Ligand binder design. Structure first.
Ligand SMILES: Cc1cc2nc3c(=O)[nH]c(=O)nc-3n(C[C@H](O)[C@H](O)[C@H](O)COP(=O)(O)OP(=O)(O)OC[C@@H]3O[C@@H](n4cnc5c(N)ncnc54)[C@H](O)[C@@H]3O)c2cc1C
Ligand SMILES: Cc1cc2nc3c(=O)[nH]c(=O)nc-3n(C[C@H](O)[C@H](O)[C@H](O)COP(=O)(O)OP(=O)(O)OC[C@@H]3O[C@@H](n4cnc5c(N)ncnc54)[C@H](O)[C@@H]3O)c2cc1C
Lengths: 476, 476, 476, 476
């Protein structure tokens, strides 16, 4: 298990090939745009060594101690342990960090347990898993193709190499060219180029699955406009520390060593990789715990805002808070059933129930925009009446302590709270979180179509056919 | 455990004091408006003796066999058993029967287990429970006051005796006068006059809880417009058999024997009766199983309609069906967590988790109108293109078999299916189900306000206060 | 202009070929299922002769007086006159009659004014218009194909003649075979078999437009389950008089005289018929006036229910009523702009603005379900606490007058009001109205796709391109 | 009519008492946070002198030329002229500037026309109007009290002088102390301290209406966190120029000259000021034109995004764009009816219809969040894949031109478009716009309650009572 210091030194020594506003980022650990999130990830690693949480965040195996997200669960009790680790980490950042490495460790863990799925590349998968686990490395991933012409398949874009495709194969590995649309949290040692959108037949050239060090020659991470509001924790409680960053990933004829290839030219293997291995189940397990943590944060802020300005006496405000409570319980329920109904898949890997997890990941994207709206409706103008800590420390401070106090709440505490509520909803950082919740697991339109097609609807149709027998009997 | 024949004979011998369109109903077992639901309840009782289900629907105790809804659960396994019985009964009628007796047996069972709550009337409660259980009697209940002037409390209506109040107390019992707004499924042996809406202080005269035989002199059940469409199972698949009926309950100076009094003149005892005894938890447990069954029925019909007319090839139709699947899984999740997180209350009675059940009963009333809308959007004009079995048996039958066939679906089967979908949504029977789901457990406005006030919001507020410490530290 | 007596005698003398539950309807003017709506239509015709409304409902021309819906408008003032007639008729039935003949007269009027559109069949159209106008006949229409396999076009159904197609052409006319899915209000003298869903190319055999007397040999109207609750105006205020009925229309090798053919074998002419002639504009004009009347009815009932039970003192109830007011004003606005922005089409016919009307007909289907929901949320249990006038006239009458009174509202008036609210929302009649509003003008999915494709989006895209010039200038 | 240069010189010479992060802003025309919006307002003033728009934006009167927003309309034609000026100005900034001065000029214009309303202060009002008009000054306003304890009235806060109240009256004027919660666009010469939230009786001390130069001693504007993303028009197309800023307004014993007092100690006069004068009608007229412009901007961007990435071929995307079209038409309809149904008020001032305007201002706050959501659903990940113009100008430029091109759309144009869509929805600037639309005209909860209480619901209730006469007749 890594310490924060080890993670920081690794990024400083071998930084990912990041670019920000036309310039290469030489040291993300000190760069104004990245130092905050780096410090945050470091804190997650340090927590693994805190006496109070060591048993929750790590497990011992043959003299070594590994992060819980690497544990291949054999019992429901093991699943619960993984869930508690997901939750503890999520709580540290109010569920605002959506791409912490444990999400991808769940994927790799499942891939390894179900390694036979990958055939000749099975050992590569098992070895890669052990590598990430032993070194406790941080990962990032990019699964979607560039949004160019969505009316056409990967092979029908303006260029054959817009999506990541194989240029050639050599004795050392494969050379790839193209790009992936989005990679969140590029402050990692490794990047996973795994499957994502159901590949249409005839996409062999793009049917790939591999992993590479983020410093690989030819690999570039082009970062989008930064959303770090500033470094003041008072003024920017969340964006100053949890801005994970999103980036376009470019592959300029990058060489991928054979040992890092997991899938090559197999459309079907790519399309069923997450489902067959159980990676989908485990990554969705991290997600449900994460969204439960996120909803708990919104509930706390909503309750404090309402109490703070005396709006809690109004029935409709109480109802809005109760709505968040209902959603919180819904997510807790999905989480509980996902673990309780867990069963082993074809490779003997225990996986949390897909019915419950598909429910959770397809419902939350609909609930989040409403939870966000609720905070807006409760806070109203208080959400934009945001003087800075500098204003409180300035000449008008005394006036602000009088006009911005709440009901039995001092002004500084009030503004600190509303600055947080604002950062969770209306700052560039907060607003991005909404788009993220709507799309990170996929496009709802296609996710729902996928659920329709994979779900076993037969039992229900059969019960209706049985019920209708009495109807058709009138013709006998 | 009662047989259907015993239930039918009991109603025939001592029928409830029902009134329909100005006339007394002498025999509900043969009356056109009630014979259907009576036959349906009888079938539920008969199922308890079917070899295939006897172990699911009943339990043995000291030489006797009782209905599962009377079982005082001591373990989570016992809770699961109660849940399976709720579900099996619910499935028989596609979750369309909302007031089957097991819902109220759950209430009485909890009242009995937590009998100490009722003080001097504790033995009355325990004895009443044993009575209902031993005779396996059917019950109905009326908890709300007449909707007259909602701007005023029970003691501020046009008359002091509009709501049910105590006129006087004698050596034999109490005399009550007034009325209860609604009682669903009056085809029962007993009626429960228990608490409902939080009684405002100073309502001692109305703070009552008692039970009476439905044939009690002075007791009247005034039934509303019947929604039985007809007796043909083809033409009216549901209304011909599951029309439970709703009625206003009048008390014309009715005498309530002391042995049937459970609460008298105690406002606080009335207000906390369901929560303290665990009746709320257990009755909500029956509800979540019931709504899961109901959602399964809608899923089956939606899938069959879409497949039947070839609408399933359209993405948005698949998405609508997937939405029902998400809601189905949400209800299953609440059900699972309610049982898994169960704990004993103050009286030692194991009760399903209130967090999960409050989530389920406050979310479903919002989901149901949408599930209903989905069926409407899928079926479109097919939902009103409803010829009768008589049309198929008539001269134009051959034409109908050609014009109303579906995709690989014969016309008679198609119409039988759409007649069912229509009866579940647009017939008077179907539309009532929507209003029922929106309000049976209470007014959402007040249910949400109640949830806000009872829920422990402190842990979440505390986590936010802890997170904000760093914000306030900038002033040190 | 026809009188009610003339309409009644016409239906009695030459009744439409209606079928109800396997039997031919010999006299719809006395049949229990149809006499109510017949009486209602008759009343609309009689209103044309009422001194108070003669100037609003009719116009004089060359010694004759015709119904306003036949007026070919030459000025905006004329458009306003047509609108006032639509509104006055709509108000008589609280906007619950959706297929009153003036809707189709608007279509025929536009077809006639733009008769050149039909080429060689132009005179047939002009003559047919004069016929309907002079005799002031009632019409019904059926535009959609049988819902069999929606995954395939009209020519790809289980049989080539499921949709109405031409079997052969003779010296006397064309012989057609097939069926139309739905025709509402079949209590008419004539049936219009006009285009509806955009016909896919290669559907020449189905590209038809003609009209026939409803008594034509081989023509059959198969009625669906009746929704007439009863004849008591107290018990069934709306269904006893406004149940228009829906039916499947069968064509058993029906002969269509050449003089009644308006379009034959021309796919493109069918697809653009409503838009090019202005029929779409005028029929949508009747619709916006109708929905304004309907919303006014719901506003009145909602306000009376809330006031009646004292629920109007609650803020959220006031907000719900205000929501209906907002929707009412939205419809009034669309109506006003539709008339004020009217311009002449390619044939010189003044047509109300399509932008405003497309807005109204695509927005109301979304607003209506909410308006209906609002009534449900306001009335709650009062909507199913529906004793009959027979109960008030019976032994328990005195009790009902006490328990069902409202706030300063007598019991009989209260129940009459709630019986109406119920009939507008939850009776079979009321629930059907919801499905009707969602689909009568077409499937929202396709209506919205149609709006996207016909709307001129260029001005807005051009303004954005102009705004972005400054953005691209940074590269100069 | 002012020129941009004159406005800039005025702010430079006598700047408003603005504060940003603890420091006084000495020159808002050059300050990084304010120079953008100042330049934008200046451009609006300069447009008044453009030959192409002079006739639209100004009118001549007795040798002078004034801004159209000052025109006291005498005819509907005059109302139309005011509307066209509102629209032309709104279009310049895509409807993103919500507090341009013409909104408040409408208020002052109405106050002046209805000056008799103010009694002894009538001449002050008339004179103030002429002052603003003649000098064509810019105004800002603050109408709400500090959000401290919303459970109590203005006189029940932690201090009597939290809200703005009169300390004393002297021969020179009144001295006020307290604060107003929010003032948007403080880059003005004058600030209007007018009424807002219905004052509870007994608030005489707070019942005020006056205006002051923004440089008045003791007056302070405390600005919130700035949302200007940067100065690059490519990177921040909107926030670089339309960030109006919001601020808390402090009154440290400010002296208000008697000539600038319009209402003093009159609760009722304050509560009915906007309605009685017609200010509400005219300010809402500017708003409907503004929101129409805003919706046109969103329609253009949505259409361009969809076309740009080839998403327009998908039905659901077309439907989403059509939804925006429906909302656009709804706003156009409200605007048209507001002008067409205009009538003179009690003071002879022609005012646009309140029914239509109340519909528009209570509906748009519900429509805007959906319009914003639609852009999010169309753009998806493209909304956060935002490289900078600096990235295009850097080493990776060539790669970006390949991977970020769209369907027949070059990469630079594509990113410029998505940067705009992002700035309109997800940047701090964009997200604030959502909160602004939800609340600028007031709290929807109270706005809807206000509409319920002011609307004449009698005609509709009367029509229902008339319809129910037939129901009650069954008892005769
Ligand atoms: C904040 C954020 C963070 C993210 N983080 C990551 C990450 O860390 N790693 C990663 O791999 N991905 C990440 N993503 C990408 C995310 O998974 C995608 O946005 C999502 O899968 C949708 O794909 P898209 O963005 O290409 O949508 P697009 O399809 O490009 O968007 C336009 C679409 O048009 C419609 N459409 C397009 N094609 C079809 C079709 N075939 N059928 C029907 N409708 C269609 C869709 O409804 C949608 O409106 C992130 C996204 C966001 C917004
Ligand atoms: C089909 C159906 C079946 C039912 N079956 C049963 C049954 O079997 N047994 C039984 O006991 N009950 C039954 N009920 C009654 C049901 O529990 C009630 O409808 C529900 O509790 C709401 O009470 P109400 O109907 O009196 O609502 P009301 O309050 O009478 O309705 C008007 C209300 O105005 C508002 N309002 C009123 N008072 C307040 C307030 N104090 N604060 C805020 N808002 C307020 C509410 O939002 C609602 O709009 C049934 C109801 C229905 C519709």
């Amino acid at each position: 298990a890594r310490t924060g210091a080890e993670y920081i030194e690794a990024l400083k020594t071998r930084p990912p090939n990041l670019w920000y506003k036309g310039e290469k980022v030489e040291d993300p650990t000190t760069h104004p745009v990245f130092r905050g999130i780096v410090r945050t990830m470091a804190a997650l690693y340090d927590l693994q060594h805190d006496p109070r949480y060591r048993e929750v965040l790590t497990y011992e195996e043959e003299g070594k101690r590994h992060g819980m997200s690497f544990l291949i669960p054999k019992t429901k009790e093991d699943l619960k342990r993984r869930g508690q680790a997901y939750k503890l980490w999520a709580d540290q950042n109010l569920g605002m960090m959506g791409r912490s490495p444990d999400y991808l460790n769940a994927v790799v863990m499942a891939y390894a347990a179900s390694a036979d799925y990958f055939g000749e590349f099975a050992e590569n998968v098992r070895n890669y898993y052990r590598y990430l686990r032993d070194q406790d490395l941080a990962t990032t991933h990019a699964l979607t193709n560039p949004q160019v012409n969505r009316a056409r398949p990967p092979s029908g874009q303006p260029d054959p190499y817009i999506p990541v495709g194989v240029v050639k194969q050599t004795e050392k590995g494969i050379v790839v060219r193209g790009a992936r649309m989005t990679a969140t949290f590029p402050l990692a040692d490794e990047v996973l180029i795994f499957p994502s959108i159901l590949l249409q037949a005839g996409s062999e050239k793009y049917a790939l699955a591999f992993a590479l060090p983020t410093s690989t020659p030819g690999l570039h991470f082009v970062c989008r406009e930064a959303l770090v509001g500033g470094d003041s924790p008072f003024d920017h409680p969340l964006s100053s520390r949890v801005e994970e960053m999103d980036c376009l990933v470019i592959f300029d004829d990058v060489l991928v060593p054979w040992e890092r290839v997991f899938i090559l030219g197999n459309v079907e293997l790519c399309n069923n990789a997450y489902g067959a291995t159980g990676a989908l189940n485990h990554m969705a397990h991290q997600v449900v715990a994460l969204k439960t943590a996120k909803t708990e944060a919104f509930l706390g802020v909503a309750a404090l805002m309402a109490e703070g300005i005396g709006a809690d006496v109004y029935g409709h405000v109480q109802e809005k808070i109760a709505e968040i409570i209902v959603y919180l319980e819904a997510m807790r329920a999905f989480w509980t059933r996902a673990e309780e109904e867990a069963k082993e898949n074809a490779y003997g890997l225990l996986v949390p129930d897909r019915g419950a997890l598909d429910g959770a990941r397809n419902l939350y994207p609909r609930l989040y925009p409403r939870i966000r709206e609720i905070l807006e409706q409760i806070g109203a103008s208080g959400l934009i009446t945001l003087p800075s800590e500098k204003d409180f420390k300035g000449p008008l401070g005394p006036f602000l302590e009088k006009f911005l106090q709440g009901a039995a709440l001092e002004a500084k505490e009030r503004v600190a709270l509303f600055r947080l509520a604002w950062d969770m909803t209306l700052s560039g950082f907060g607003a991005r979180q909404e788009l993220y919740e709507r799309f990170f697991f996929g496009d709802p339109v296609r996710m729902y179509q996928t659920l329709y097609n994979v779900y076993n609807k037969e039992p229900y149709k059969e019960r209706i056919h049985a019920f209708l027998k009495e109807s058709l009997k009138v013709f006998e």
